[PDB]
Design a protein around this ligand. Structure first.
Ligand SMILES: CCCCCCCCCCCCCC(=O)O
Ligand SMILES: CCCCCCCCCCCCCC(=O)O
Lengths: 281, 68, 239, 264, 283, 235, 68, 234, 68
């Protein structure tokens, strides 16, 4: 059988030199008292468990992490909008990063699902054939395409997915790919150490984990040639960690995020509500 | 090469003992070469909160004075 | 060759889906695991950590460090020093403690909750404090007399600087909602002086106490939900 | 053999007290040397032993009744500390655990409390608003001197000179995270009512088995005046706070020409 | 692998001139009469192979029913923005046929299957090309944030469950485990969420009574996924539900009159459900 | 990978479907069960409970409490007191009973039906009643004489006041329809006096009787259908 | 880890269990770890109406006068 | 027949797929294999082969044969005579060697790197060179002193015409990026004279050295990626 | 007629021994008559660098002077 939470044993009145209800918070230890130490209790049997809050369950759902914008353009301009290159990150989304940021370190495999949706944004509606999209991963160090029709879309090594609109949302599994044994959610350091002969103005984005995060980019394009009647396609990227362990827990952020790091906005330094009094329930 | 295991219980199930009926079993086969492609793992419900709630070198008993 | 029939639910994307999928990066050599201190296996392990209660959320204390300091004084008064609605993921004062933050991701919760109080006055100061909990009925106590008619502990201030009270699981239900709800209201916690704080010459007349809250070992949660505690402007796709 | 009395003996220095709370071993783990099974570099390691694993004192700070806290980075503080400091500049890689002992003496008539929290990866916000993550090396790494917290936020949106600094807000712990949950991190509290000292054993924590100390601060330390300092006198007496740190099981790898970082 | 039970078989009988006369059985006792044909008439022996399977509760409650209909609109007109967003509480107030069947019991325990049927039409005179739509359904448990609009951050659904459905594929489906905080769902609640006291208003609780005051399992949110098209398109979403793995307790009669509202309220215009006949002796 | 063929019936939504599906809330542990009394396992357990028959729903006595009260008296009569069509689904009065209500969720039914009558007179009242069932396909019972060519019980009023008759399962078919049609003739149930009710001076002269109907243990139903008694405004 | 059991009978069966040999067997496999995902249970034809039709303290006999 | 559910990812094409598929040419006779010499089973077998380093990158020696010829003189000098940034894939001097090119098909790499040198001067000339590797995060090896502080060997010229210096895998990370990631700095490889080259009368006083780079046996690579060294018109 | 093999490890998996847990197991069946239709082969980590790095007729030792 799986473990359940502990049962509470039956108790009665106590008159002893034992002090389970008294402690010393200063030690760094939490209080250890349970109802059986403080009040008379009955025997209960606990069949309730905590699987619902295990880390795999906590992090068990896919979340939207970014939105990409692709356009099929019949105009002389906006050819460039046929493809969209995004830095891979989860920091565009606050709900997911907040959950991940409960831990200093994490190790997990990741799976991605994409959802495509499209409309006809122009007043001049007309026939458009069903379109196909290519999702290409460009690893760090790999070349970027300059255009939707750029030769690098050949993908001889870069992995990619060809999705035809209307089929089941495309999907793929990614193994843990850190160069460390665990992913770092936080990094109190610099990518490079400025040395004595260097300028004293020594910030310039070197500070923070952001400066050491290069997981490549995701390049998505429509794979066709322009059609007279244009399309705006929105691609929502979903992520779900899988097989996840974490270490060195930390409290969540109470205020709105400012960019990639832990920077704060002056408009959100006061996260808690006021009350009328200390004595109001 | 199937794995066979117990399902989490629901409305019409037993005493949450999983020792009453074989109708609570389910099966699965891994179909991909990398384990990263598998389903989420079986839940490990082992816990040890003491490493975060009472990380003290010199152990106190809860009924002992915390400080003697 | 094998005849098949597609069921309802076919070709849909469920965010709760646990089906197997192809690896985009086959045969990848995964960096080996190492020992890392502080492994967390369950979120509940963090829920059991005692953290401070931002009780003093009155105008001028709210959102500053004094918010966590419960005032105490040697003046004689029968008035309560504090009051809390026991609704750990709803009460403005509790929803942002670590226990509340974990619970903010859950819809339903259960089990006893422990409240620990740390007196930070001088060694020279003494007195007695009454902590009390009552089930969600009748009236919130506004008098020590009624506070006694419930679950309570009297704390001798002394060398053991702290004490705790546990609000036992008393509920008509198995699980209470996290959402504010009269049906599932959790009860009341109050504190009164049993004995006024006694202050000798050269000792300050005002003191602070730090209150803490944590999950007890029998504590559990049922169901995940999104938290109404973080937000952002609408996201617009790069173009 | 009471819990209130301790003797800490590392290297060639001993710290004693007649008043302490039992020491915390973060996560229940002691610092150890890297096992062959988890080693990255192949360079036979430098193991300074007593040369590094001894206590050093950081400059004492005064606790005023208006203080909002102090912070230090652990490996940064020890950067100029004798042989430990030299090995840091001589090797690319290095690893150490720490023993941290914090003291603050007071009269029986004083009240107030200092929380001592250790934050693995203590990352503080940029005080510029403007461009994100803009922090200078020099201000990020103050040495044993440390830096402080304020109860006001005033990002220098119009000037980098006050922007290269951290937005060290006390009530959001410099990161946007509420101070009341600081207790999640390993911590011990010095309550002037009783306990005049705190001891925490700090394991090395990283995603790596070993890293470069010149680039990364594995741990930070925050001392927060959770309960105000007070005394009946209107003089609002200040009391000293002394932070004493020794590295543990120190090892270094990657001997190189000695480096010197950008200076003030 | 065994023979299922059949309904009661009949033994052969003959008339009995005795003091044992089961026909004359009291009901004043609360018991029902138990006589069967073998007790009152001469009978033929009959082997009984008939099986009460459709009458078992699992079968009675084993079919999906439409529960509600949601209206979702996709349009380029700015005044229609709010119509791309549809919020609905889960209740079976909206569906007479299913509510009535559930009512036969005071309490029930079951897992529930949900299926969604989407249908598209043009609500206006517009009829040009639009692109195939995608719909998102997310469930928002009580206490979770609600979206303010169809296009918002809460749609991230990091912890809330959700389904993305492409129009034209098989209707999406999901199983929901029992979610009560009780050991059974209550079909009825003879009580108040809170008890007013200490001299507060005597009318207190007047609008906070009955099952609705304690019934909150969350809300279902459905939204258009696509950016707007020049030609307005409307989707009717039919939500179907089927309980399964079901146990029930404490029988009750079914409602005999037209329901009105969530609870047991009668409608004054329809409280006369029984048909009249011309005579007690009509046949 | 594995070659397959999609057969007809694929990707359809059937309301009677019994296929498996992903859990939206996977690994939710179910709130533990407790014993609750009154567990119902089969709808037939409720069909077998005696329910009042709304027999006197005539001329304003319809949809009132008096609707279930069958009048009786001390006069001379060779006429029926009451008459019911047997069909539990089509008879207007039997349909609106617990048996009829469960039954109306079904199209086919079979088995014997129990009719129980309780006399609520004075203790000093006496008399004897003739209750009978006449199988279908012949001149209806009409008077008290033709009514005896069939199954009958003579109810001698006494302390064991309540009594019952079972209309035995007689049919040509295995099952009968719940729907009214001309073929599925249920037969008739009527009751008339053997003798008038007799009471002593200065006691009530009129009395009421309460009839009940219930399923016998051999009873069953088959195919489910929507019930015609439920209605709603268009949505 | 499949379950095998009999089917509800149809038009060409003799209505006896196992009297139709293997004709009436079917195979079912649970494909999910959560029992909520399972298809409906085996019909449970067990029942006991006395809870509602003869809920009495003094056992009644059919032939005894009910009011003994 | 058999009830089934299509999952996300259905009816999509992944270039990384590894699925079975019907044969377009059923029952085809595959010409039998023979023992073809020189079998390669793994790309690392090529990574371990010593190839030349195009060290003489000075304008005018670029894209010519002289590109691989490192000049030496008997002139007394304390100057560095060699400066590599190590990153096998991103260093302009290494990215075009076979080791560098193999790595330009990978995102990450690990292991120690070997540098082998060959003296091609007169038989008559002798002397000693300092070959040195200095870990990153430090002032470049400005002079011989700094080179001596780091990892080094002395190559005493004689009959054994070549020598090998190894730059061990000292890294904070397990793997480094192949990409020019300032975070995973290579460190520095340099060379100083240990002593002036001793040249007897009537010999050349200017000679060349060749250098080679190869993987050590603890070397490996991770994810495959497109190489930036090749292109074409649309 | 399925064959089985060890799956490559992932984030929550065991040490590099890959011997711990029967749950690391990818199962496969070939569905076509031509083996050209089969999925890719098992990783072959066999290596022989000497063919290209040390194809010396003489026996050369690393400690011995290369020359003599
Ligand atoms: C074919 C697509 C391959 C995508 C590779 C990148 C996978 C996610 C990298 C980890 C995300 C950052 C975590 C962190 O902040 O520590
Ligand atoms: C992801 C979707 C979650 C849906 C949760 C709601 C499930 C139904 C709640 C129970 C409603 C009352 C049932 C009853 O009357 O017996």
């Amino acid at each position: 059988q799986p473990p359940s939470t502990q049962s509470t044993e039956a108790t009665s009145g106590v008159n002893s030199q034992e002090v389970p209800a008294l402690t010393a918070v200063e030690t760094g230890a939490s209080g250890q008292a349970i109802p059986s130490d403080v009040v008379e209790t009955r025997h209960v049997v606990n069949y309730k468990t905590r699987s619902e809050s295990c880390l795999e369950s906590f992090f068990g759902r896919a979340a939207c992490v970014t939105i990409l914008s692709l356009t099929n353009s019949s105009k002389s301009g906006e050819e460039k909008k046929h493809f969209n290159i995004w830095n891979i990150t989860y920091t565009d989304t606050v709900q997911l990063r907040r959950k991940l940021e409960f831990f200093t370190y994490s190790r997990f495999d990741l799976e991605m699902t994409f959802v495509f949706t499209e409309n006809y944004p122009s007043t001049a509606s007309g026939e458009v054939r069903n379109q196909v999209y290519q999702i290409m991963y460009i690893p760090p160090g790999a070349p970027r395409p300059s255009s939707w029709d750029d030769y690098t879309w050949q993908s001889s090594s870069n992995p990619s997915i060809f999705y035809m609109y209307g089929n089941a949302p495309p999907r793929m599994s990614i193994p843990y790919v850190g160069i460390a044994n665990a992913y770092s959610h936080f990094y109190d350091g610099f990518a490079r150490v400025p040395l004595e002969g260097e300028n004293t103005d020594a910030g310039d984005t070197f500070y923070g984990l952001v400066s050491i995060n290069d997981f490549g980019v995701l390049a998505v394009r429509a794979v066709n040639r322009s059609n007279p009647h244009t399309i705006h396609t929105s691609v929502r990227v979903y992520m779900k960690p899988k097989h996840i362990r974490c270490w060195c827990p930390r409290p969540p952020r109470a205020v709105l995020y400012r960019g990639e790091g832990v920077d704060m906005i002056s408009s959100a330094i006061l996260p808690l509500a006021k009350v009328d009094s200390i004595t109001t329930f | 090469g199937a794995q066979v295991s117990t399902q989490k219980t629901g409305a019409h199930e037993n005493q949450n003992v999983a020792a009453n009926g074989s109708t609570i079993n389910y099966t699965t086969i891994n179909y991909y070469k990398d384990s990263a492609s598998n389903s989420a793992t079986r839940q490990d419900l082992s816990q040890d909160p003491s490493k975060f709630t009472e990380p003290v070198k010199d152990l106190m008993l809860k009924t002992a004075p915390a400080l003697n | 060759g094998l005849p098949t029939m597609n069921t309802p639910g076919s070709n849909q994307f469920l965010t709760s889906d646990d089906f197997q999928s192809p690896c985009a990066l086959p045969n990848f050599d995964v960096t080996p695991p190492i020992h890392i201190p502080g492994e967390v296996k369950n979120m509940m392990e963090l829920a059991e950590i005692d953290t401070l209660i931002p009780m003093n959320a009155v105008d001028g204390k709210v959102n500053t460090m004094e918010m966590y300091q419960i005032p105490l004084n040697d003046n004689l008064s029968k008035a309560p020093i504090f009051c809390l609605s026991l609704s750990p993921a709803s009460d403005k004062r509790l929803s942002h403690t670590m226990l509340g933050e974990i619970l903010n991701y859950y819809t339903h919760w259960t089990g006893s909750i422990r409240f620990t109080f740390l007196f930070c006055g001088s060694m020279m100061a003494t007195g007695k404090l009454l902590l009390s909990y009552s089930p969600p009925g009748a009236k919130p106590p506004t008098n020590r007399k009624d506070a006694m008619l419930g679950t309570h502990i009297i704390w001798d201030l002394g060398l053991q600087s702290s004490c705790s009270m546990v609000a036992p699981w008393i509920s008509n239900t198995v699980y209470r909602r996290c959402a504010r709800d009269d049906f599932t209201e959790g009860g009341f916690i109050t504190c009164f002086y049993q004995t006024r704080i006694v202050v000798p010459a050269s000792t300050p007349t005002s003191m602070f106490m730090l209150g803490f809250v944590s999950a007890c070992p029998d504590f559990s949660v049922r169901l995940l939900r999104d938290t109404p505690h973080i937000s952002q402007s609408k996201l617009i796709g790069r173009t | 053999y009471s819990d209130r009395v301790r003797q800490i003996t590392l290297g060639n220095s001993t710290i004693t007290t007649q008043e302490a709370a039992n020491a915390i071993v973060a996560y229940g783990e002691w610092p150890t040397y890297i096992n062959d099974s988890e080693a990255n570099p192949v360079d036979a390691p430098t193991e300074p032993d007593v040369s590094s694993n001894r206590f050093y004192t950081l400059e004492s700070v005064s606790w005023k009744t208006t203080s909002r806290g102090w912070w230090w980075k652990l490996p940064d503080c020890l950067k100029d500390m004798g042989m430990f400091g030299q090995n840091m500049y001589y090797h690319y890689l290095g690893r150490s655990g720490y023993t941290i002992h914090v003291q603050c003496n007071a009269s029986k008539f004083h009240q107030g409390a200092l929380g001592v929290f250790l934050i693995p990866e203590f990352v503080m916000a940029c005080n510029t608003e403007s461009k994100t993550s803009y922090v200078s090396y020099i201000n990020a790494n103050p040495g044993e001197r440390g830096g402080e917290f304020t109860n006001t936020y005033n990002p220098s949106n119009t000037d980098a000179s006050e922007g290269r600094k951290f937005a060290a807000l006390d009530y959001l712990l410099g990161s946007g995270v509420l101070a009341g949950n600081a207790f999640v991190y390993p911590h011990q509290i010095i309550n002037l009512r009783t306990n005049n000292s705190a001891t925490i054993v700090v394991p090395y924590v990283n995603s790596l088995v070993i890293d470069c100390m010149a680039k990364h601060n594995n741990w930070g330390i925050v001392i927060l005046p959770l309960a105000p300092l007070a005394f009946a006198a209107t003089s609002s007496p200040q009391v000293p706070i002394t932070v004493t740190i020794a590295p543990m099981c120190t090892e270094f790898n990657g001997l190189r020409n000695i480096t010197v970082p950008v200076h003030q």
